[PDB]
Design a protein around this nucleic acid. Structure first.
Ligand SMILES: O=c1ccc2ncc(=O)n3c2n1C[C@H]3CN1CCC(NCc2cc3c(cn2)OCCC3)CC1
Lengths: 511, 381, 511, 381
DNA sequence: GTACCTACGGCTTATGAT
DNA sequence: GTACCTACGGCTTATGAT
DNA sequence: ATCATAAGCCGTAG
DNA sequence: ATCATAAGCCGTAG
């Protein structure tokens, strides 16, 4: 059986591959700025129960679990992704606090996956806060046996804080990091005014930030990038001349190198350039870097101003490198070039939706709790007839049915809001003193203990009931009024800022 | 090249032997252990292969084992293995490496493609086992039809319509048309909300002639908004709007919905009314309202339950069908048993191969790699 | 600070390495015949909860868990050990039922650890039966944070069933497999008579067994091995001549090869020997092996009897290979050459000890259960005064103290063995009708529910009490009488035999 | 050889630089990232190394980087790196590779060993952190003494003996002697059961002169068996036996114990009575009976509890001490931070190296590999 | 995605020496 | 115990051609 | 003197 | 013609 097939089959397969990759592998999302791999790793670490205030764990457990349940694509990629997050010099705010040889700027790779130890950091629990309260949707795994959160209910706009860099079949993205307090201030400003201009936002956010400080020259590049979505920016290292108070000679000190530069490759290339005589005025080369800060010393050839040498280096050496800012991410499962205002608006909308859903969930939970507690109190009111009715009833099911069948007296000491103290699916034929029960209520009553018969539990139940009434009233009010929701979001953002603020590292000297 | 990986067969005469190409270590072991030892051959591979166009150098060569083993690379002289087959995984990387191999063959040896020697295999995709009942399923639509047939195992509905016991091929076709319409609605959902699209199932009909009376439009939109606010169990509301954009009337309804923090309107125009999608929706709505499916009784097969929603009854039937079934999905050739691999892929009586043609001389392989065709071709919108 | 050290330091370090290896890595134990790696793997699989009647699981989970918690020695060794157990042609009774490419006799290695699926087999749960009832001791892990069983409470003498082969620093061991029913029959015979001779045991156990059948020639070797501990044995493949009814020609068929022989290497070596003309009368070589049994066909050169060729092959070809039987294992943490009778005696002693400890544990558990149930019944007897005493008592602790303080009436309907219905640590001042309580009993009474007040729970409690009395009486009797213990062991062994018997594979033709 | 792995220092003059040897990929990264860049050097290694004696061939060479980098292999001419150090893990494989390297050096270049250039490092073994209190512990006996000191943080016992408040160095020495005796008993346990060895702590004394009266021996063994049957909480019993193996008396007690299924006797002889182990046991028993430690009161430091057993009080004190401590054990050099590695191993002020000597010319390296010395030397019994 | 080095004993098989 | 090949886009840097 | 062509690296994957 | 010497492979480890 060999049915003839046209050659056009090539187009259908390749298009499928491209459409799968672009959606599922490289490009991050605007709502949280997380690739699916990072998502699944964080979810696995949370499900396993590895918080920050606990003992460390071996990498093998986490890697094996991730390969087993959620991400069936080998091990090397997953382990490299984990090692990447732990390095301080590669992320402005690390997520996976580790312990062991994680490599360094010298280009040395990390140790094997059977030596290191990892656990979450304090900032990590802020990403996955309120996960169990039904705030997002769940998606099936590869075989349809588990559930995976679609988007994390975040509290921090990670996309602008860290950014990422991926290369798809047709598109490619690149985003610089930023500072946290400035992003929070910009979000506050946009919450105050919906129609803020790009100039206003640029006033609150001067420019990017890097894990290692540097110097930035051009203002046109970052402005064009924030306004349109494309632009270029230059990065310049920090150095200066030195002359001893006495005869001595002139010497250059380098304190910090640009972003993502191998130091050993740099030293070797400089040695090669000096050997090739392409550069002038360099005699030797040494190193003094230690555990107190990086320090490179270059000895200037005698009778040379050295500043022309420094300019020639800046022209030819890796000490000055460009950077291809290009903002591309997914908005509804489709790549779209998006500027700053769009990102901020998306973040705000996501936060609103999460807050609303969490509020609804907590309201329903408190409603059901109060509904059970009411019947429990009513049962506690009349005890002796229920005692006799149970003692006479041969069958527990028959006792439940008898409890359901008869009304109840509702003593005076037993006896809130006009409504909203009862669930939605409850029918108006219950709770019309006069009072009736339900099968669920009767089972709850039968599931009592004897410790509930002292002069403490009565007051405890009354207090719990009053507290639940107050809470459900507050929740109904916060659902009703949108200004209250805005105030809540503002307070949460201010708290996050006060908790996790810090100072600037880089510096922007305009031309 | 010839030793190391290639494992030929006993026969040496070409035009009778078969050759295969797979991922090396994982799949080749099972392939060798399950193949035949008479007229079968296997050539494993390593990872991926460089493009012919993106990097073209007659000196650029790393493996070359394919050419070395197939011919001398020119081709009319030596013609060993007149039949070649490409087995590849069912993931996306499988299709990727498939496309790479196909463009390699096309841009290297056009004659071997013209003379019909390349073949494509079709590995199964799903293994369904319901106790004794086993099943090999290879395609998504096949799996869908199988699930539909299992859910529709001779059920019999009892409404109060003209049919005392509605059942059979009529019900099957009705469920199929409903599923097609639901898929179409889910596809168009990207444009408009879902509440209105789902409620127009039960809402009455509509016609361009209704733009005369304002009261007809008002009653229609009021019923719609009232039923929407009734069915709204989440945190949202619904409001109506009547607008006149014409010289005299051209009455056009407008719906005002209030989600979390921002309202959004959705006007109705002549183009929306005339759209074939809305026409199909109205046809299905009329067909479903002509049913009187309120008091219903369908059994499959030892239990029946009356509900008030056709889709809820369908969901209950699907749940009853999917209670106790088992499904295994093979996500790699190096995962199944050798005898299963034999019986499902390389049995000269049970396999289902696929042949390639040379239809035209086109520039698809040219738009392949210039980055401009790459930027423009994804117009799947 | 550099203190002078003698050169003798070499002896102390090497001796430590040897003493560690010999005890912990290679040599198995006489009590279960299991290397520590197999032990830890089985224990991890049991703790994870992967039984035989459940769905499969990926190898990555198990491997990562074993590396993480119990066996910190990399991954390749562990995965190879797991793959070794799954192969049918390498163990007489496999333990790890798997699914995927596990290699074959052709020398092809198994697939990567990200494709296969594994789970325990039905015979595996017989190795680890009664593990939680405190039958063996627990040893700390490498960091002292977990517990590991020392020896498995087995029901099968695995050492004689499968055997092993390891190479230590000074010693080396090797043991052939055997058949199960014969070992069980020998154990029964030794249970009947303590002073059986070696000839008697050799009567019940003819000889070894192999996963693939073969032919054995020498009886002297196995006899000397069983009697002393060392010996040699020959293995001969099965083949025969074939002549067609008509003219045709003579042809050789091979059905099965000896133990642990690569088929591809064999075919290549035979082709080489034919090419070198060292052997005569061989024309060509073919293969017909399929999924119905291995089949190798050799075409005899015309005008050759071929039997001389067959004898020359048997002399030179791998078709006849020797085997170095050498029985060495650990008896109390020290290597000792041990014969058959010693192994059987050790097995019997281990089984006796396990049974006794399990019986003691179950006795104590039933004792405590009955002790609680007695007080619960006594409380159920008098209900109304306890109701009033709880209703008046403000504090639950005060209510407990009041319940402890006063005696109780012990109504007539409320009222076994002369003794043994009360725990050991219980003092004679309780239960002297007259009756007193305990704090534990009072807490149990306070932890009652209302469902215990129907005309069903009374009879259920009375039935449970009678059953517990019968059970504790039976346990005391089985602890008292050793003949009962022997009968129990005999019955268990007979049941195991009837469950897991099978037929012989190999065959022994004496010279 | 010279490139690839070796990372020398700035100084080129020998007799001032340091060289190290470790396992390559895991440890070398941390070593490089934590070392000094003035007079330090690192040479990673791969796996294990072949023996010099078991396989001797001047042509047999695989790595040779050690020789190529150290000298020209002859040695008086080039003498670079006058100081070499061997860092190695604390496991058993560490000691194994250490022995291999040492025998290599010895059988290749005797002069470099004679002139005192080889050194051995001593990495720490335990990291104990009690809140603020940190501690680096390198040895098992050091860890034991540390645990003892933590458990004995100035406690004060109150018995009814001659000392109103027994405490201090006397109690420390008593606990130390008790621990030594318990270790000796655990070592000798391989011979005799443990119940009798533990009960002779509190049982009265004994003397060879007691073989005169049969009643003295009878009373002694009766008290012993009665206390054993009292303390027996497991499934066992105890029975006595009186035997006369002499011309007239030479009375010798015999104990009959009944375990699970078989009884076992344990006679008492003149050699057992005179044994120094039994003598130490009797001395300790007399010292402990001269205490009257029944009504005791020891506090450490905010709680005290009277018990009836000195060992039970000691166990309670150990438990109170070990309630809330933290211990990290480094089972590999590629596990700690680079700064910690620096401070604990390669600080010219804090490190604790070790020097090797050339004492005699012996055949230890000959008995190394002949399989006969290998079979005979493990006489650790 | 994939190949090639070492230890440890006891068995053999191949090969050149006396 | 450990090293070296491939895809995918966008940036650069080096190098020889016109 | 000015332009076309060949490389290397960044992160998930094989 | 008969004896001493050098190899290869089996399974947990590096
Ligand atoms: O394929 C090759 C070919 C040659 C080669 N040379 C050196 C080398 O180091 N390697 C070479 N290779 C490859 C690599 C060895 N490779 C084997 C697989 C291993 N897998 C690591 C692992 C996987 C898992 C673990 C732990 N570790 O636990 C969880 C479950 C999965 C990593 C090292």
């Amino acid at each position: 059986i060999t049915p003839v097939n046209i050659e056009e089959e090539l187009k259908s397969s390749y298009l499928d591959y491209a459409m799968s990759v672009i959606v599922g592998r490289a490009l991050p999302d605007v709502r949280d700025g997380l690739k699916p791999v990072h998502r699944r790793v964080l979810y696995a670490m949370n499900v396993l129960g590895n918080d920050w205030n606990k003992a460390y764990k071996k990498s093998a457990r986490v890697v094996g679990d991730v390969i087993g349940k959620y991400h069936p694509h080998g091990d090397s990629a997953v382990y490299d992704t984990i090692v990447r997050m732990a390095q301080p010099f590669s992320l402005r705010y690390m997520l996976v606090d580790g312990q062991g040889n994680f490599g360094s700027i010298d280009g040395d790779s990390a140790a094997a996956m059977r030596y290191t130890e990892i656990r979450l950091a304090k900032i990590a629990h802020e990403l996955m806060a309120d996960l169990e309260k039904e705030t997002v949707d769940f998606v099936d795994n590869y075989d349809g046996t588990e559930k995976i959160p679609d988007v994390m209910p975040t509290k921090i706009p990670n996309l602008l804080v860290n950014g990422s860099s991926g290369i798809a079949v047709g598109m490619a993205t690149n985003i610089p990091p930023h500072n946290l307090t400035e992003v929070i201030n910009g979000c506050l400003a946009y919450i105050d005014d919906e129609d803020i201009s790009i100039e206003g936002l640029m006033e609150h956010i001067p420019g990017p930030d890097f894990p290692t400080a540097a110097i930035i020259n051009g203002r046109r590049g970052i402005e064009e990038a924030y306004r349109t979505g494309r632009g270029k920016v230059y990065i310049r290292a920090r150095a200066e001349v030195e002359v001893d108070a006495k005869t001595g000679r002139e010497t250059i000190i380098v304190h910090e190198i640009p972003y993502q530069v191998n130091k050993a490759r740099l030293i070797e290339k400089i040695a090669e350039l000096v050997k090739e005589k392409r550069v002038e005025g360099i005699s030797a080369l040494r190193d003094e870097s230690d555990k107190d800060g990086m320090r490179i010393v270059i000895e200037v050839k005698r009778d040379a101003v050295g500043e022309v040498v420094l300019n020639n280096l800046y022209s030819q050496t890796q000490l000055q490198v460009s950077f291809g800012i290009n903002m591309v991410a997914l908005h509804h499962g489709q790549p779209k070039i998006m500027n700053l205002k769009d990102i901020i608006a998306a973040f705000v909308r996501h936060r609103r939706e999460v807050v609303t859903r969490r509020t609804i969930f907590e309201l329903r939970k408190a409603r059901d709790r109060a509904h059970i507690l009411e019947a429990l109190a009513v049962a506690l009111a009349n005890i002796d007839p229920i005692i006799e009715l149970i003692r006479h009833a041969p069958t527990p099911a028959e006792a439940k049915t008898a409890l359901v069948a008869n009304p109840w007296q509702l003593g005076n000491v037993a006896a809130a809001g006009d409504d909203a103290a009862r669930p939605e699916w409850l029918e108006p034929e219950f709770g019309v003193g006069l009072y009736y029960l339900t099968e669920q209520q009767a089972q709850a009553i039968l599931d009592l203990r004897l410790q509930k018969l002292t002069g403490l539990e009565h007051e405890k139940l009354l207090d719990e009931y009053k507290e639940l009434l107050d809470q459900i009233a507050e929740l109904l009010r916060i659902l009703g009024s949108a200004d209250r929701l805005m105030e809540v979001i503002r307070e949460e953002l201010e708290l996050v800022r006060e908790q996790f603020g810090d100072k600037r590292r880089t510096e922007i000297t305009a031309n | 090249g010839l030793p190391g990986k290639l494992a030929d067969c006993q026969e040496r005469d070409p035009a009778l032997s078969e050759l295969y190409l797979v991922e090396g270590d994982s799949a080749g072991g099972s392939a060798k252990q399950g193949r035949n030892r008479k007229n079968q051959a296997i050539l494993p591979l390593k990872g991926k292969i460089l493009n012919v166009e993106k990097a073209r150098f007659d000196k650029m060569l790393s493996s070359q084992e394919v050419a070395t083993l197939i011919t001398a690379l020119y081709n009319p002289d030596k013609l060993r293995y007149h039949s070649i087959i490409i087995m590849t995984d069912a993931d996306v990387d499988g299709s990727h490496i498939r496309t790479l191999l196909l463009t390699f063959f096309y841009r290297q040896m056009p004659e071997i493609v013209e003379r019909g020697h390349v073949y494509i295999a079709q590995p199964p995709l799903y293994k369904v086992k319901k106790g004794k009942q086993e099943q090999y399923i290879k395609d998504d639509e096949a799996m869908d039809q199988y699930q539909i047939s299992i859910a529709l195992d001779g059920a019999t509905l009892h409404t109060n319509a003209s049919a005392p016991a509605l059942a059979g091929e009529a019900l099957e076709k009705l469920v199929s048309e409903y599923n097609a319409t639901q898929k179409m609605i889910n596809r168009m959902e990207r444009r408009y909300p879902k509440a209105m699209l789902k409620e127009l199932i039960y809402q009455p009909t509509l016609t361009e002639a209704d733009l005369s009376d304002e009261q007809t439009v008002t009653r229609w939109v009021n019923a719609l908004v009232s039923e929407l606010n009734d069915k709204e169990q989440h945190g949202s509301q619904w409001k109506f709007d009547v607008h006149t954009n014409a010289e005299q009337n051209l009455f056009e309804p407008i719906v005002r919905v209030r989600t979390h923090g921002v309202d959004t309107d959705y006007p109705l125009d002549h183009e929306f009314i005339t759209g074939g999608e809305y026409r199909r929706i109205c046809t299905l709505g009329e067909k479903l309202r002509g049913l009187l499916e309120e008091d219903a009784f369908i059994e499959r097969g030892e239990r029946r339950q009356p509900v008030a929603s056709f889709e809820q009854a369908l969901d209950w039937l699907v749940k009853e069908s999917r209670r106790g079934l088992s499904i295994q999905r093979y996500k790699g050739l190096g995962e199944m048993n050798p005898e299963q691999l034999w019986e499902t892929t390389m049995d000269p009586e049970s396999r289902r191969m696929l042949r390639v043609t040379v239809k035209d001389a086109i520039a698809a392989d040219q738009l392949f790699t210039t980055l401009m065709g790459d930027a423009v071709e994804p117009r799947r919108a």
